[PDB]
Write the C-alpha cells for this entry.
Amino acid sequence: KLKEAETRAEFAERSVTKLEKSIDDLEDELYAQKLKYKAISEELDHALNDMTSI
Amino acid sequence: DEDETTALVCDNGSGLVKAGFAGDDAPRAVFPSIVGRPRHQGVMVGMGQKDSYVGDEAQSKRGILTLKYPIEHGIITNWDDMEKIWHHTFYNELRVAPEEHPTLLTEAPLNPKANREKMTQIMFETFNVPAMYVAIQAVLSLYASGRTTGIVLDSGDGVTHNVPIYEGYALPHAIMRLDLAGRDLTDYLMKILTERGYSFVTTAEREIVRDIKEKLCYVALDFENEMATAASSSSLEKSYELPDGQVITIGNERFRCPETLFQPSFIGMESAGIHETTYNSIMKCDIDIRKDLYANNVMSGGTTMYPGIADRMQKEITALAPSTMKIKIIAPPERKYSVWIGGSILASLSTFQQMWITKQEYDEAGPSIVHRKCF
Amino acid sequence: DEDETTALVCDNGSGLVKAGFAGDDAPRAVFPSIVGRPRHQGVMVGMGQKDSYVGDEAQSKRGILTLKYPIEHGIITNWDDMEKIWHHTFYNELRVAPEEHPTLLTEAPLNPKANREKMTQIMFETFNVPAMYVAIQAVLSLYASGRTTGIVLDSGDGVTHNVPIYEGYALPHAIMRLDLAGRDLTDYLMKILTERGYSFVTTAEREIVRDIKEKLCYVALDFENEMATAASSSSLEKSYELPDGQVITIGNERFRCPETLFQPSFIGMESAGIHETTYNSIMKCDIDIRKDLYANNVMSGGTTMYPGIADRMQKEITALAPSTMKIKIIAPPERKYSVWIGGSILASLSTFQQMWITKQEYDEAGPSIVHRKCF
Amino acid sequence: DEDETTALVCDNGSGLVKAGFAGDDAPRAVFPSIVGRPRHQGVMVGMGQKDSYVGDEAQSKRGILTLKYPIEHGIITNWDDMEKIWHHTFYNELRVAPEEHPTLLTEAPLNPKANREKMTQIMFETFNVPAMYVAIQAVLSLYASGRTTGIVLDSGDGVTHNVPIYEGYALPHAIMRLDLAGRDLTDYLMKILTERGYSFVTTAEREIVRDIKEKLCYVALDFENEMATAASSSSLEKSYELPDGQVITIGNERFRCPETLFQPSFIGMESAGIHETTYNSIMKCDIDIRKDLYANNVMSGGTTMYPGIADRMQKEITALAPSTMKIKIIAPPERKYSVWIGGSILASLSTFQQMWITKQEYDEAGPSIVHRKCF
Amino acid sequence: ASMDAIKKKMQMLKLDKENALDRAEQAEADK
Ligand SMILES: Nc1ncnc2c1ncn2[C@@H]1O[C@H](COP(=O)(O)OP(=O)(O)O)[C@@H](O)[C@H]1O
Ligand SMILES: Nc1ncnc2c1ncn2[C@@H]1O[C@H](COP(=O)(O)OP(=O)(O)O)[C@@H](O)[C@H]1O
Ligand SMILES: Nc1ncnc2c1ncn2[C@@H]1O[C@H](COP(=O)(O)OP(=O)(O)O)[C@@H](O)[C@H]1O
C-alpha cells in the first residue's frame, strides 16, 4: 500500500512536476500570448488610431 | 443476487479474463486465461489430482503444472480450454448459468472472423445461452471512458489493434494493427533479466517475470535520459521478491522492457511503436476528423498502467502532431478494466436490446450470423 | 412570433440559403444549401446520429458525412432535400410556419422552368403557403440598392445570370447566362493548390477549399501586374490554417482563383469573363437603354465580396465600354445580401399585394401557374 | 550494350519502374521502385553488406531489409533514393551513361510541380544529362494505344489520373483525378486476408501480398453475383503458395481488392468509383466530344491487368452512357507498359526534337525551366 | 478594431470628391 501510495505520491510528485512544467508553460504561454497578442493587436489598434487617420 | 436475466459480460485475452454481470462497474472475478496441466509422474495415490486445473486453480497448483494459455494474440484457438474457463467463470464465481442469461464476449475488429464465429457458437451450443453479442473492445473502452470520439489504443496482452472512432462511427481504413503486446514485453524482460544473471525459461519463471513487469516496470517520458541514469546508478534500481525468498534487483531493464512498445525492434518487429501507430490512425482519417482525434487519444486495456505512460503518449503524439492542434489523452483509473466496464454499459443499453442474437436466430443461421448481427 | 401575416423571404441557391421575414433589413439566419448523410458504418450503440443533416447541421458533423447540394447551377433537382431545407430555413430558425404566411423565392429568366415550378409547388403542396411569388434576383438587388435600372451581375455559386433591367423592366434577350461560378472557382483553386502540393478531393476537403477561397482570395485591379509581383515574391503570400494543424501557403494562386471570372478558359469555358458578359448584356440593348445600364453596373450575390471585385469590374467594363460616357459600379456593403433585402422590400410593398399567386389560384391552375404569374 | 546515341526512357512510379531506350517497343527491365536498408544487427564480419540496396538488390536481400519507395502517390519526396534508382537503372541495367543521352521521365499533368522540377533538376545536376523532357503519362498512353482521342485511365500504384484528350488536346476541366490506387488495394487486401486468418505486417509480408494480388486478384464482370458464389463456395477459391511453404486460400477477397476501385468506400475514400469518374470525364466534355470519348476508354498502368477490368469498365460505362453510341474499352497487351512504350515513341518523334530541354538552357534558366518547356 | 473611422472618412472624402466631380462634369457639360 506504501509502495502504491508512494507510487501515487511519486506519481503525484511527477504529475505535479509535469504540471509544474505545464503550469509554467501555460504561465509562460499565456504570458507570451498576452504579451505578444494584446501588445501587438492592441498596438495594431493604436496603429488604427493613426492608420485610419488621413 | 441475480433475479433478473441480465446479460453476462466476459472479456477474454491472452493474459486475463475479466468477468461479471451486466449492470456492475467491475468484473466480479478475474480468471487469468489458463488451463494448467501436471508435467510430472505421480508416486503417491489417493492424492486427488486433476487432469487439468482452471483459472486460479492453475496458478495455485502451478509448481508442477505447465501453464497453457488458449488465446494467442487475442485469438481463441484452444476452444476446449475456453469452455473450461467459461464454465468455471460463470458457474463458480459469478454464480450464474449462461443458459438463463444473454452473454457478451469481445474481440479486436480485425481479429480473424473465425474467432467471433466460435465465440457465438460455443455459447449457443455448449452453454445454451438464450442470446449472444460479440463486441468491439475499442468501443467498450470508449463507453467506459465517456467518449464517442478518439483513437483507441488497446495496448494489452495479445495484439494492439489501434482503431479511430468518430461520433460513434468506425473509420476502419485507418486501423493500424501491431503484433506488439504484453506477452512480447514479458519475453523481452526474461531475456534481459538473463543478462543480469537471473535466467527465466520455464512456466514458473515466466509467471515471475510477468509479475515483476506489472509491479516494477515503467516507461517514463525520455528513454535515453532515463537509461543514462539507470545504467549509471543504483538510485534507479528496484528489488523484487522471488517465490523462494531470493531477490532480484532490476535497473534499466525496468524500463527497457516497456520501451518495446515505443521500440518494437527490441523484439524483432519492423515497427515504429504505439505512438506512431496512434498518430497514423489520426493522420489516415479525414481532414475534418483529425482535429477531434488529436484532442482524443483514448487508452484501452493494460500497459496503460505503466508510470509515465499517460504523459508520454500525449507527448509523443504532440511531438508528431502539427502545432495549433490541441492534443489530449484520456487515461482514466478504469484502466486495465475499461473494456469490461464498457461491456456492462453496452449490454445494458436500451438501444442495444435489438443487437442481441437470439438462440432461435442462431439455430436457424448458424455461426456466420455473428457477421450479420454483431459486426 | 410574428404580429402580422408578413411574407417570408428566402434567397436559396446552389450555394447558400438566406432567410428572414419581410420587413426586416437582413435574413435572420443563413444556412448552406446542404443535406448531409453519413458515409460510414456506425460502431457504437446509443450514439444518436441522424440519417440526414440539414444546413449547418450538415457542415458541423461533416467529418464523416458526404455533403450534397439539392440545387446545382441555379436549379433545384432534389426536391426531397429541398423540403427538408425549407422546413429548417423557415420554421426551425424563424419559428414561422408558411401555412399562415406568403413566401417569396428567387431565380432569373434563363433559369429552367422546373426551378420556379418546384419552388412554387413545394411551398403550396407541402407547406400549404397561402401565397407565392418568384422574383428575379436582379429585381431584388436593384430594389435593395435604390435603383430601377442596372445590370445585375450575380456571380453566384453555380451560375452567373447577368440580368439587365431598365426602369423596372426586364430585358431578357440580353441576359448572359455563364457557366462560371463560385463552385468552379473552388474547383480551380484546388487544382492550382494541387500544383503546390495540396490535393483536396473529399467533401471535407472541398468545403475547406471554399473556406480558403472566401477568406484568402482577391481579385485586384490588374492581374498581370499582380502576378508579376506575386509570382516573384513571398511578400504577397498568405497562410491558411487547415483544421488539422497543417498550413497551406497560397501565392499568386490567391488571385488566380477569382481571376477565372476574367479568364473562364481556366475551367474550359468558351468565355472572356463576367465583365464581357456585363458589356454584352448592355450592348444587346438599344442605345437609349445602354447609357443608363453602363452608369449602373450592379454587384449582387456571391463573389462580390472578393477584395477588388467592384473596382476591377468598373475598370474592366470601362475598358470595353465607349469613352466619354461614365461607367460606374453600385456595390454597397449590402452586397450578397441585396437579393434577400430586395425580397423583403418587394414582399412588403403595398402595390405588391396584387402580385402574389394565391393558393386558390395555384390549386386551380397547377404548378405551371408560376410561369403565368411571376414574370 | 545499346548501339545508338538515343534518348533514355524511364517510367519511375510509386510501385515499379520501367526502363529501356527510346526507339524500342519495351523496357529492357522493370525493377521495384525501391531502396532497401538493413533492419538487423550484423554478427559476422567480412560479409560484404551494403548500406543501401537498389531495385532488384533491394528485393533480393529483403529478408533482412526494410524497404521504402521514394514516390508518394505520384510525388517524389525522397529524391536521394530516386538518384539511387536512376543511377542503377541507367548505369548498370540499361548500361548507359546519362551524360551521353537525353532522358525522358514521366508524371500526371496535375501532379504537384515539385515532382517535375526534381526530375528535371536531378538528371541535369547530378547526372549531367545533355537534355530532358518530363512527359505526360496520358499522352504516352495514347501514343502506345494508337489513339489521339480517349479517356486515359492510368489507374496506377499511386494515383488514378483519368483524363479526357480530344484530337490531341487536353480537356482539363473534365479530369476526374482520384486518390484511389494499387497501393491502397494492396493494404486493403492485407486487412481482408487478416480477416481470413492470415496476418501480414512487415515489408516481406507486404511484398508477398502484392505478389498474391498480382497473380490471384480479378475484377469479375458482376461483383454481386461473383460474391454470391465466391463467398458461399470453394469452387471460386484459389490458393497461393507463400515463400515459406505455407498456403493461403482466398475466396471473394480475391475480387474484393480490385472491387475497391469501383467501391472506394472499402478503404474509407469518398468517391464515385473509377467507372463513374470515367463517365463524368466523358460527360463533362462538349456534345461533339463525348461521342469520341465513349468509343475510346484507354488503359495504361497497373490494375488494368486484373482479369475482367477491361470488361467491367466497358459495361459500367455502357450502362450509364446513352444509346446509339458504341462504348468501347481499349485494353491492349501493352497494358501496364503503355506509358513506357509511349515514352519511347515521344522521345523519338521527329516532331518532338525541339521539345527537349538542353543542358545549356537548363543551366541558364534553373529548375523552373521544366514549366517553360515540358508542361 | 474595425477601421470604421475610415469607412466614415472615406465616405466624407467620397462625398467631397463626388461633389467636386459632379462640378467637374457639370463645368465641362455646361460648355
Ligand atoms: N502496471 C502494469 N505494468 C505493465 N503491464 C500492465 C500493467 N497493468 C496492466 N498491464 C498488462 O495488461 C494486461 C491486462 O490488461 P487487458 O488489456 O485488460 O488484457 P486483456 O486482453 O486480458 O483483458 C495484463 O497482462 C498486464 O500484464
Ligand atoms: N468573400 C467571398 N469570396 C468569394 N466568394 C464569396 C464570398 N462571399 C460570398 N461568396 C460566394 O457566394 C456564393 C453564394 O451566392 P448567391 O449569389 O447568394 O447564390 P444565389 O443568389 O444564386 O442564390 C457562394 O459560392 C460563396 O462562395
Ligand atoms: N497482374 C497484375 N494485375 C494488376 N496490376 C498489376 C499486375 N502486374 C503489375 N501490376 C501493377 O503495376 C503497377 C506499376 O506499373 P505502372 O502503372 O506502369 O507504373 P507507373 O505508375 O509509373 O505508370 C503496380 O501497382 C503493380 O502492382
